[PDB]
From Swiss-Prot, chains A, B:
This is 1-deoxy-D-xylulose 5-phosphate reductoisomerase. InterPro entries: DXP_reductoisomerase, DXP_reductoisomerase_C, DXP_reductoisomerase_N, DXPR_C, DXPR_C_sf, NAD(P)-bd_dom_sf. NADPH binds at T11, G12, S13, I14, G37, N117, E119, G196. 1-deoxy-D-xylulose 5-phosphate binds at K118, S142, E143, S167, H190, S203, N208, K209, E212. Its cofactor is Mg(2+); Mn(2+).
Amino acid sequence: GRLRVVVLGSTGSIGTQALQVIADNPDRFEVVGLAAGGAHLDTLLRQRAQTGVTNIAVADEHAAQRVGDIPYHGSDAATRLVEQTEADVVLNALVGALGLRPTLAALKTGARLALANKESLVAGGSLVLRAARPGQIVPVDSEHSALAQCLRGGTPDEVAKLVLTASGGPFRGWSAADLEHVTPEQAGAHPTWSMGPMNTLNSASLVNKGLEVIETHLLFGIPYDRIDVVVHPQSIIHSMVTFIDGSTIAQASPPDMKLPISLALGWPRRVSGAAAACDFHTASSWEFEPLDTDVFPAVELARQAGVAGGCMTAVYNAANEEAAAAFLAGRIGFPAIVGIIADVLHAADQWAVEPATVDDVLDAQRWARERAQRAVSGM
Amino acid sequence: GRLRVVVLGSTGSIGTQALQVIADNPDRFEVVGLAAGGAHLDTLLRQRAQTGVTNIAVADEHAAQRVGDIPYHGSDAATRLVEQTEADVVLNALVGALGLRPTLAALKTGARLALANKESLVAGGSLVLRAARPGQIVPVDSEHSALAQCLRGGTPDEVAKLVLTASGGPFRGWSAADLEHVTPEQAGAHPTWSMGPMNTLNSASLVNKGLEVIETHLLFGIPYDRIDVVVHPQSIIHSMVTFIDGSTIAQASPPDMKLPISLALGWPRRVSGAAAACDFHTASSWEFEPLDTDVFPAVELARQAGVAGGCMTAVYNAANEEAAAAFLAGRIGFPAIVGIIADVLHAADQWAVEPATVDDVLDAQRWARERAQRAVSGM
């Protein structure tokens, strides 16, 4: 029947798309809570008005006064909302380290976690996994959503390889020399999704694919050496699974996040009309090419951090946040993005120990941000 | 555990490939019976020697004496073998009307029917369906095998469309005028599979795709207006399913019938190492284009016979057998192949009644062969 959904990060692109899927399907879903940072308030006010949901969390205190009548405000508003709201699904679409505590709180309640927040897995690692039951986390990322669907093609013992697709970004087929004089607006050219400057940048530097590889390992328990990345410029195939008999099962759709959002909210039940399907009435082609790992080391670096274990993938993510920002702020070169991540990881051998608590993870990320900051300061 | 398999049509390409899969996997499968027509005897003798299976059916009487010590020979040898052999799976890879009685006998025993024989469904229609339990028939055809795998992607009520792929054949993108002066060896040019002159011809005239559309309807209970055909020259994607949310799930592999054979024998359990998987270490492309139904009417004609129901699909198949042979024997033109099928169907309104018995189906096919023969005689 109808599922009660807490929407964390409601004003971002995933949050607003989720609310649209919810509004179109009132028999399947109802919103019971909203959390937002506070950066966008005209949006949050409209969502309050349209849904009638007054059970809202706003992190920013000044934003919280400006909107008025907000029950959860300040530091851990989102966590408190999740702790005190009865729900069937928590959609965690918060950005950054802010998402980890709401994730653990959400898992403690027994609800399904529709996970969009990368930090939860990439930084939380085993902490989050230990907190979750089998099937409790359902991925919202289009690649992981595609994998979950393709995995219906057999039992776990029959999986040979998971194959993630990457667009290649705007610099697909460029030499390392070419990348040396890449500018912020070159990087943020023709984006597949519409989720902001940082996100489009991570697609260009292939760090997004690196983070997804890490999450694939954690979500599906497949070793890093059985997780492939292929470049697929059309971004129509969203991932594939190759099975032990030689069969490959692929998921394909015109890019539209409403599809994986709807599936994550409603899992295992599909949502009629969520997105447009591939249309075969006009000729088209789906192209595949190997990733040039020499020019784009981000994915191999992700594998190195993943295999190292412990707090290393938290270090990889934290270092990218500082390094990628520094590039957008005209302060370092494009190649130096992954360059800095490597330098930080190479210095991070103390963080190869598994974290015991959330504070351990936050300390590692604190360390990595500072170390990356220091590295940026020398350029 | 280990499954007892009766292999009907053991000397043809599907039969010999199935025996190879069986020999490679003695923990999964054992041969308990072999049926062959009698055209190839050196092969049948080698199979007797290697498997030690003396439980053999040979249709041809003269062949049966020549080989020696054959327990089932003559008219309904294959049917008798199936009736009297204890098995878990019957692989029906017989060609033509000869396969229908063994199919019904196989279903009566309770065994899984790994169905390669097109005549069973295309001609048998509702007779065969009424004889089968849910899940009892498992398709061997690479398109139907692909569909069965993709259908794991949701429940039946979530299916929107089934999409079969067709190579387009050697005359893909040719005008109707171009097809008028097509010769037998032009038609049998560069075949995807290796199953004889008739089979390669049916791929060129698109009658093979027409028969597969009919079988798709009967196997999966999807209406003809939700069964699409797309042309896909690489023949790597073997079919797709589009679901109601907009997601498409596709099955892909380098052409090799050992994959679907192995899956049909072992369903639902995959068979490690059956075939090579797609390799993404070298650039490639998968192309899609609409089928030109004006130039290639065979699929639309199949839909017309399928919707008409009763013995009409049996008529479509019987008329093609006579008409396609007549083309290979230098007696009619390429366009006249589907031309004759249309003329026979248009005259076949008495066969729109459902068949009650096997003899009804055989009478319809007898009628259609004669009518097609008469039509050929006037060219």
